[PDB]
């Protein structure tokens, strides 16, 4: 209770250090545009849902937009790999927003098979396909490349970070759709896996006037 109170500032901090992190130049991309989406679907669901807990209205519009966005990226990232060119989906910056805007109202005009099954039924395979056909390439590479020099293993971990974010939101909201507090847990797990996995590490940990390893 009064002990778990420290769990809200967690859904009001980590999700803001992120929104601001995105809102730096280099951090602005389609991927970090949808991950920055699950920020308002964790902060709003913490400064508007967690506090008072219309209250059951934004409780659905929040969780039905998550496993929906998770369905988005899983496909976006795919279209990025299946693509004949470089790794970075074609969803333009504006059409990412226009596509972003339509994920909320449809999340508002919205069921476990509509707002949960459907979005997780495909999202797990559109990604499965990906995490898989991302391996064939991973080393269809030149072995010599990297040891004699004179998509790579890096972007292979970027799908590891996006590979657990989609892999934690499943074991957190499944036992519920099959415990209502376990689902809230994925509110301080994303900005937590982004530290020891993706670039965010420095992006936001050093934004707080150089955290620690700032050549301390």
């Amino acid at each position, epitope marked *: 209770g009064i002990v778990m109170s420290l769990i809200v500032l967690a859904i009001v901090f980590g999700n803001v250090l992120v929104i601001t992190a995105i809102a730096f130049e280099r951090l602005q991309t389609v991927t970090n545009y949808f991950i920055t989406s699950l920020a308002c679907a964790d902060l709003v669901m913490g400064l508007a849902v967690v506090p008072f807990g219309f209250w059951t209205s934004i409780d659905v519009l929040c969780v039905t937009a998550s496993i929906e966005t998770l369905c988005v990226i899983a496909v976006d990232r795919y279209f990025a790999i299946t693509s004949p060119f470089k790794y970075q989906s074609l969803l333009t910056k504006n059409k990412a927003r226009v596509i972003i805007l339509m994920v909320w109202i449809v999340s508002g005009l919205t069921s476990s098979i509509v707002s949960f099954y459907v979005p997780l039924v495909i999202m797990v395979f559109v990604y499965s396909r990906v995490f898989q056909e991302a391996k064939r390439q991973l080393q269809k590479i030149d*072995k*010599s490349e*990297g*040891r*004699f*020099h*004179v998509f790579c*293993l*890096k972007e*292979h*971990k970027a799908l590891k970070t996006l590979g657990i974010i989609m892999g934690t939101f499943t074991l957190c909201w499944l036992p519920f759709f099959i415990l209502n507090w376990i689902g809230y847990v994925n509110s301080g797990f994303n900005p937590l896996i982004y530290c020891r996995s993706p670039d965010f590490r420095i992006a936001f940990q050093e934004l707080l006037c150089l955290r620690r*390893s700032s*050549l301390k």
Partner: antibody, heavy 113, light 108 residues
Framework: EVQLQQSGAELARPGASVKLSCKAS????????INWVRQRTGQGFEWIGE????????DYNERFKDKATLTADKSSSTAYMQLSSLTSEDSAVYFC??????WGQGTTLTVSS | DIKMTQSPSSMYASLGERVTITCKAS??????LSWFQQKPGKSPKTLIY???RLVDGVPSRFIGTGSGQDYSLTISSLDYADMGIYYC?????????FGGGTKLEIKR
């Protein structure tokens, strides 16, 4: 001016654990993995594992699977190797290569009483 | 894992002649083989990789040429400083495995 610095001489009591370092300095650490190959006295080379500084991937050789644990330092631009429960036969020269291209100096580790 | 024999072992060539060691692996490494030289009192200096692609700095009289399952490092016009122990390495798959290296001496 390309080079991976090494200790050259390392003494350790049987059963203990040494931790060899390799300070590369003359290129971009994270652009080449770096393997650690052990070469006992006499002759012979036996790959202990390869760790890619840039990512994190550390493919160990079964044999030294549980024995050694590779690790890199993006800042220091130096890498390491953890060799636990050393034995009389773990003694030898340990090489820190840059993916078989440029070899290191060497560390004449010797497990002894 | 992947045995890789390497004849010869012992070898005596006199200056000027072209000496040659041949390496043949167990599997089929896609030319993912390399050749280096161990000199007494020194760390190994790599000469070739990708079965034939001379490393930068290695003298142009060194020549690696094999394919699929058998290769060979070779030098035309053996120079005096060319004395030591050359070994072949494959990095096609884990665990990387070394040859046994042949050793070459110069008849004086």
């Amino acid at each position: 001016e390309v080079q991976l610095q090494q200790s050259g001489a390392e003494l350790a009591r049987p059963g203990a654990s040494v931790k060899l370092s390799c300070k590369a300095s003359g290129y971009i650490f994270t652009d080449y993995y770096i393997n650690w190959v052990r070469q006992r006295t006499g002759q012979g080379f036996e790959w202990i594992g390869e760790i890619y500084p840039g990512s994190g991937n550390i493919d160990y050789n079964e044999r030294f699977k549980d024995k050694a644990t590779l690790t890199a330092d993006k800042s220091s631009s130096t890498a390491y190797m953890q060799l636990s429960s050393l034995t009389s036969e773990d003694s030898a020269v340990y090489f820190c290569v840059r993916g078989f291209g440029y070899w290191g100096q060497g560390t004449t580790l010797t497990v002894s009483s | 894992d992947i045995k890789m024999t390497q004849s010869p072992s012992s070898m005596y060539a006199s200056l000027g002649e072209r000496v040659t060691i041949t390496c043949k692996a167990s599997q089929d490494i896609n030319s993912y083989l390399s050749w280096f030289q161990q000199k007494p009192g020194k760390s190994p200096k790599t000469l070739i990789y990708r079965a034939n692609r001379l490393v930068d700095g290695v003298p142009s009289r060194f020549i690696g040429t094999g394919s699929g399952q058998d290769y060979s490092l070779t030098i035309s016009s053996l120079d005096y400083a060319d004395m030591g122990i050359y070994y072949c390495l494959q990095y096609d798959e884990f665990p990387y495995t070394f040859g046994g290296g042949t050793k070459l001496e110069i008849k004086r």
